[PDB]
Amino acid sequence: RKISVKQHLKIYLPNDLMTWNEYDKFYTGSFQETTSYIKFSATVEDCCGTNYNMDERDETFLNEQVNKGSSDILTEDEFEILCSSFEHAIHERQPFLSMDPESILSFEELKPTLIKSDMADFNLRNQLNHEINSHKTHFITQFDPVSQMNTRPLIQLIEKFGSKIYDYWRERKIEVNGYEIFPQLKFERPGEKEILNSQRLRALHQELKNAKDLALLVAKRENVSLNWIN
């Protein structure tokens, strides 16, 4: 017995002898398609953004227990926006909270820090929104859903009611020992389940800000069109 090799021939003919139902209020909206196929280059954390949600356990003290006679309309969006802000904001100025959430630090020395915060430069737009002068509106993306033409920003609730948001935030970090309430993953380690600069690339700044000053007047070549309508 052997295995065949190259060069050989071919002789064909000559004579040898459970469809789920409650999905309708989850996935809404339509989505167009273009004759050019999609090209995309962004991350999925920027497609979600505010990386915390608060469950049924603590919305029931915020939605129907705060709003008895609360003068400011304290809605559930900033109940998720502002709470997720200092979930972040405590951790970049204290990265060692894990072994002791009995070391839950106080706002009375956090009180200038998170007010001037720029959360991994979260407000990267408003200084450049100066150049497009779209402060009549705000900045809207396709990376932003249809529920943010009515939202309200951060600082003018922290001294108002944001003194009473980190209060309930603390006590369920000690039962989970200093992590997110639906905890992060098995992230601790991949363990168990359960002179060349000098000559050519010295113009790499110049390579791409040719488009950045291009970007606003090609955003103004349509911002001559949404003031055309007014």
């Binding site: 040719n210 291009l214 007047l217 103004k220 070549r221 001559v224 003031n227």
Partner: peptide, 23 residues
Amino acid sequence: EQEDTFDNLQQEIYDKETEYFSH
């Protein structure tokens, strides 16, 4: 007054598009 900004920027595209994107 909605269009007196439309009548000067449109050449800054071509003055820039023939600056780097047309060598």
